[PDB]
Amino acid sequence: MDHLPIFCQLRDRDCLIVGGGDVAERKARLLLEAGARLTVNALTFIPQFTVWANEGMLTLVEGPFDETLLDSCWLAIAATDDDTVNQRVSDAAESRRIFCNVVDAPKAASFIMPSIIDRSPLMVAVSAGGTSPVLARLLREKLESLLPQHLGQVARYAGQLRARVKKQFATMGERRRFWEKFFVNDRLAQSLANADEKAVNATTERLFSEPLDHRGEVVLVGAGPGDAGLLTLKGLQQIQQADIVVYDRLVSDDIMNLVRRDADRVFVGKVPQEEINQILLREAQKGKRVVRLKGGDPFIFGRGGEELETLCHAGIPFSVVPGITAASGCSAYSGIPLTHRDYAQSVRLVTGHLKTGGELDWENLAAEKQTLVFYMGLNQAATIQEKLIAFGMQADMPVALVENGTSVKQRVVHGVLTQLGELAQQVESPALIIVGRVVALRDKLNWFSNH
Amino acid sequence: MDHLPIFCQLRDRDCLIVGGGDVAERKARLLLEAGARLTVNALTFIPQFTVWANEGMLTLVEGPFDETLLDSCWLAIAATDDDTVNQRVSDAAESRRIFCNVVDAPKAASFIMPSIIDRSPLMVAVSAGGTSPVLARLLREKLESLLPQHLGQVARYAGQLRARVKKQFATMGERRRFWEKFFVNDRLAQSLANADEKAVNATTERLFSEPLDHRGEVVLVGAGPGDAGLLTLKGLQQIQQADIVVYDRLVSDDIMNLVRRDADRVFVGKRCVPQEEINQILLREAQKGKRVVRLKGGDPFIFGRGGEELETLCHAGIPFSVVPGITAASGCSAYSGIPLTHRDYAQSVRLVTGGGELDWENLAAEKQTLVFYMGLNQAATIQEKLIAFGMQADMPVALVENGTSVKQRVVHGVLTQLGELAQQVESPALIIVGRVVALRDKLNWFSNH
Ligand SMILES: C[C@@]1(CC(=O)O)C2=NC(=C\c3[nH]c(c(CCC(=O)O)c3CC(=O)O)Cc3[nH]c(c(CC(=O)O)c3CCC(=O)O)/C=C3\N/C(=C\2)[C@@H](CCC(=O)O)[C@]3(C)CC(=O)O)/[C@H]1CCC(=O)O
Ligand SMILES: NC(=O)c1ccc[n+]([C@@H]2O[C@H](COP(=O)([O-])OP(=O)(O)OC[C@H]3O[C@@H](n4cnc5c(N)ncnc54)[C@H](O)[C@@H]3O)[C@@H](O)[C@H]2O)c1
Ligand SMILES: Nc1ncnc2c1ncn2[C@@H]1O[C@H](CSCC[C@H](N)C(=O)O)[C@@H](O)[C@H]1O
Ligand SMILES: Nc1ncnc2c1ncn2[C@@H]1O[C@H](CSCC[C@H](N)C(=O)O)[C@@H](O)[C@H]1O
Ligand SMILES: [Cl-]
Ligand SMILES: [Cl-]
Ligand SMILES: [Cl-]
Ligand SMILES: [Cl-]
Ligand SMILES: [Cl-]
Ligand SMILES: [Cl-]
Ligand SMILES: [Cl-]
C-alpha cells in the first residue's frame, strides 16, 4: 500500500506547525480538536492565530523557522508558501524521525492528512495519496450519505458497555455474537438518538439476557473463478466475519485480500480430501465460524458434498454460498456465451480428471446442438479431440481454451476441433475447454481483453 | 475528536514489532504491505516469520525486548501475550515519542490501527477508537463491497492524465463532471488493470472526445436466482452507477431494492415484450448517452438470450460488458442440498431447456445430473420419454421453485412421480434428475417452505 493509516492520540503531545496563513489555520484547528499541545512558528499570522493565542490554546513563535522547536514533537506540519522553508522543515523532521506533512507536496511528506467523515467516536478517513484529490472528495460525500448521523451514539454506547460485555461473556466468540446483534438492532439505535433511556435499558437487558448459540458452523463459500468482483455479497460477508478460512489454490489472491485480516488462514492442496473434512469438523466443533473458501462454485466439481456429509449427524450447523463457476466466468469474459438462440439446447459441464478406471461416454458427448465445457481437461485435450472426432463431431467445430478466466492474466486460444490438442500445449492450468458453435461468437461479443 | 487519522508513508522506514505469534504475524504482514523496514523482536517466532526472514523481507531479533531496537524507529507495535513486556515496550516508545500500538489494549497505545480498505493509492480507514471493533469490521465489509477492485488504477492514471488540465474544461463545474465520467468508467479501469493499453487510449480519448453529458454504455448484470446476497460485488457496483436499469421480473424485488435510488427503471417483463423491443430499448437508451444496466435473473449467458441483446449494441459502437451471475442450477443446488456433482455420481451436469426436439436417448444416458430450465410444462413428456428411453424408474428427481428465496419450495421423489410432482410447483422452477438428488436429506440446510 502507498500509506499506512493510523489513528493518533495527540492529547497533551507537542506538535509544531510552521506557517501562519489559511492552510496553517485549517491544520491547526484539526490539531487543537485532537488535543495537541500546538506551537505555530511563522513569519506572519492571520488573525485567527491571534484569537487562539489570546485564549491560551496554542503558542505562537513569530519569526523564521526554528528547528529546535521540533525537538519535543510527535508531529510536524510544513504550511508555509515557501518551498525552501518547507523542505528545511521536512529535513529537520526526518532527522528527528517526526512524521511530517508538507501541505503543498503529498509525495514529499512522511504523512498526508486524510479527508475525515466524523461520527465520533466513529471516524472514516479517505485519501488518494494526493494523486486524485477530486476522487477523494466524491468518495467523501458518498461515504457521508452512507453513515447515519447517529452512528456515533451507537458506537459511544458500545464503549460504555465493553467492560460489562467482557465480564459477562468469558469467551471472545460469545462477545462477537453479542456485538453483531447489538450493532444491527434498529430500535436500540433509535432509542439512543431520542435519548430514551428506559427504552435503551429495556432492549439492553434483553440483549444481555439472551442465550447465545455456542456451536460453531461451517460455510462453504464459492470464491468464483478469480476476479474478486465476482465474489457474492454473502460470500464477502462470510469471509469478512469468519474465525478461520480453509482455502485451496484456485482461490485468487485478490479474494484472499478480502478475508478478515484478524482471521486464521489454512491452505490445503498443492493434502488429502478426508483430511480437509476433519480440519473443518473439529474446528466447527471447537465453536468457531469456519469458512471453506473454494474456487468457482462449491457443488460443481468442488467435492463440497464430501466436505459437508461429515457434518450432518455430527450436529454441526452448515450452509452453502454458491459461486460463479468457471464455465460462467469464462463464458462472460471470453465473449463466448454458453447458450445462444439455438446454437445449443444443452450445456454439458464435463470433468476430464476421471476415476482410476473411468471412461467418458464419448458417443453421448459428441451429440450436436450443445456447448461442451471440460473442467480439469488440459492434460487430455488430445484424447478429447480424438474421441470427439471418432463419434461424429465435425472437424471444423470451433473450440476455445480459457486460461485463468476473469483474471488480468486471462489468455484465450481458440480454433477448430482438429487443433484442440495443439492449442492445449499453449496454456497451463487452470484452463477450461469450450467446444461448440458458440465459440464463433467470440469475435462479435468479446469485451474484456485480447490478453 | 479523540484520535487524528493520518496516512503514514512507511517505505524503508524502520518500524518494530515486539512479539512473534499469530498476532504479531498479522501486523508484520500489514507493515510489509506498506514497505516498512521491519524488525521483529520476540522470545520465539512462528514459522511465517523465519520464511519472511529467509526471503530477505524483514529482520528478526530472537530474545527479550531490547529498547535500543527503538532507537532509529518510526513506529512500534506491542504484540506479545505478556502485559509486562507490552507495557515496557509502549513506555520505551513514549519516552522516544515513537507512536505505538498495543494490540489488545487500545488506550495503552499512542495510536490505534483502524480497519483498512486498500485501493492504493486510494485508501479508506475505519476506526471507532477502540469502542466498536465489530462495527469497524461491519463498515469495512460494506466499503469493500462498494469500492471497485481497480479504482486504484484509475486513481493513479487520473493524477497523471491531468496534462489535459483545463485543456477543454475551464470551469471547476465542467472538470468535476469529467472526473465524474472518469472515475466510474469501469471499462477504462479493467483495461488499465489488464494492461491492454490499446483498449486504454481507446476508452481514454472517447472520454475526451464524446460530449461531456454522454456516458453511453451497456452492462449485462446477472442478478442470480433471487437471494439478494447472491449478487456479485461488481453486480452491485454496476447497478449503483446505472442511469437506467432494464429488468425483467425474473429479477427479485430484493435485487431491485439495491438499485440506485435515482436511476430510472424500465420494466421489460411480462404481466409479453418480444426480444427485439428489448434489444432496441437498450440500444436507444444507450444512444442517448446513458449508463444502461440490463438486469437479468441468474446468469445472462445461460438461457438468458444475453448474446442476442449484445448483438444489437455491437456494431452501433456502443461499449458493453457482462457481469456473470449465479445461475439457477448453482443457486438451487446450494440452497436445496443437492450438489450438481458428488463423488462418482455424475461425470457431467446437463443444463437443458424445456424449432426442434430434445434428444431423449442422450438425456437418458447414465452418470449425468440433468437440470431442466423452463421445463415445468414438459414435465410429463420428460418423465414419459426418459423412462421409455431407458432411465431407471427409481431415479431420484427434485423440483426447486423460487430457489434461494425466502419462499423456496423443494418437492422430491422418483422419476415415476415427476409429472405429478410438477403440479405442486409454479414457475420459476428447476427440475433436477440424478442420483445427486438423494443427498438432499443429508445436506438440506435451508428451510423448506
Ligand atoms: C482493524 C484491526 C486491525 C488491523 O487492521 O489489522 C483491529 N482488530 C481487527 C479487528 C478485530 N479484532 C478483534 C475483533 C473482535 C472484537 C470484539 O468482538 O469486540 C475484531 C472485530 C472483528 O473483525 O470481528 C479482536 C479484538 N481486537 C480488539 C479487541 C478488544 C480490546 O483489545 O480491547 C478484541 C477482542 C477482545 C475480546 O473479545 O474481549 C481491539 C481492537 N480492534 C480494533 C481493530 C482496534 C480498535 C477498534 C475500535 O476502537 O473501534 C483495536 C484496539 C486493535 C488495534 O488498534 O490494534 C482488525 C480489523 C480487520 C478488518 O476490519 O478486517
Ligand atoms: N493547485 C491549486 O490550485 C491549489 C491546491 C491547494 C491550495 N492552493 C492554494 O494555495 C494557497 C496558499 O496560501 P495560504 O492560504 O497558506 O496563505 P498565506 O500566504 O497567508 O500563507 C503563507 C504563510 O506562510 C508563513 N511563512 C512564510 N515564510 C515563512 C518562514 N520562512 N518561516 C515561517 N513561516 C513562514 C507565513 O506565516 C504566511 O502566513 C492556499 O490558500 C490554497 O487556496 C492552490
Ligand atoms: N479461472 C479459471 N479459468 C479457467 N479454468 C478454471 C478457472 N478456475 C477453475 N477452473 C477449472 O476448474 C477446474 C478445477 S475443478 C473446480 C471447479 C470449480 N468448483 C468451479 O465451479 O469452477 C480446473 O481444472 C480448471 O479446469
Ligand atoms: N429462482 C429460481 N428458482 C428455480 N428456477 C429458476 C429460478 N430462476 C430462474 N429459474 C429457471 O430459469 C428459467 C428461466 S430462463 C433464465 C435462466 C437464467 N439465465 C439463469 O441463469 O438461471 C425458469 O424457467 C426456471 O427454470
Ligand atoms: Cl488525494
Ligand atoms: Cl465511487
Ligand atoms: Cl465433486
Ligand atoms: Cl443456444
Ligand atoms: Cl439462450
Ligand atoms: Cl446414474
Ligand atoms: Cl416452465
Numbering used by the authors:
A (entry chain A): 1 to 270, 277 to 457
B (entry chain B): 1 to 271, 276 to 358, 363 to 457
What does the paper say about this structure?
Siroheme is the modified isobacteriochlorin tetrapyrrole used by siroheme-dependent sulfite and nitrite reductases (SiR/NiRs) in catalyzing the six-electron reduction of sulfite to sulfide or nitrite to ammonia. CysG is encoded by a gene fusion between a C-terminal SUMT (CysGA) and an N-terminal bifunctional dehydrogenase/ferrochelatase (CysGB). The N-terminal enzyme module, CysGB, is a three-domain bifunctional dehydrogenase/ATP-independent class III ferrochelatase12 that performs the final two steps of siroheme biosynthesis. The C-terminal enzyme module, CysGA, is homologous to a well-studied class of SAM-dependent uro’gen III methyltransferases (SUMTs) that catalyzes the methylations to generate precorrin-210,13.
A soak experiment with precorrin-2 and NADH resulted in a structure with low-occupancy precorrin-2 bound to one active site but NADH, also at low occupancy, bound to the other. Precorrin-2 is less oxidatively stable than more highly conjugated tetrapyrroles, and this was apparent in the weaker density of the central ring and partial occupancy of the molecule as a whole. Precorrin-2 is a highly oxygen-sensitive dipyrrocorphin that lacks the ring conjugation of the later, more stable, isobacteriochlorins, sirohydrochlorin and siroheme. Nevertheless, we see similar changes to the conformation of the helical domain and surrounding loops that are associated with tetrapyrrole binding, so we were able to assign a binding position for precorrin-2 that positions C15 towards the Rossmann fold. Interestingly, in the precorrin-2 bound structure, D104 is in two conformations whose occupancies correspond to the partial occupancy of the precorrin-2 molecule. Consequently, although both tetrapyrroles coordinate positively charged amino-acid side chains with their eight carboxylates, the ring of the less rigid precorrin-2 is not as ordered as it is in the sirohydrochlorin. Precorrin-2, oriented with the C2 and C7 methyl groups buried in hydrophobic pockets and coordinated by positively charged amino acids at each corner, presents C15 toward the Rossmann fold where a tightly docked NAD+ places its nicotinamide ring.
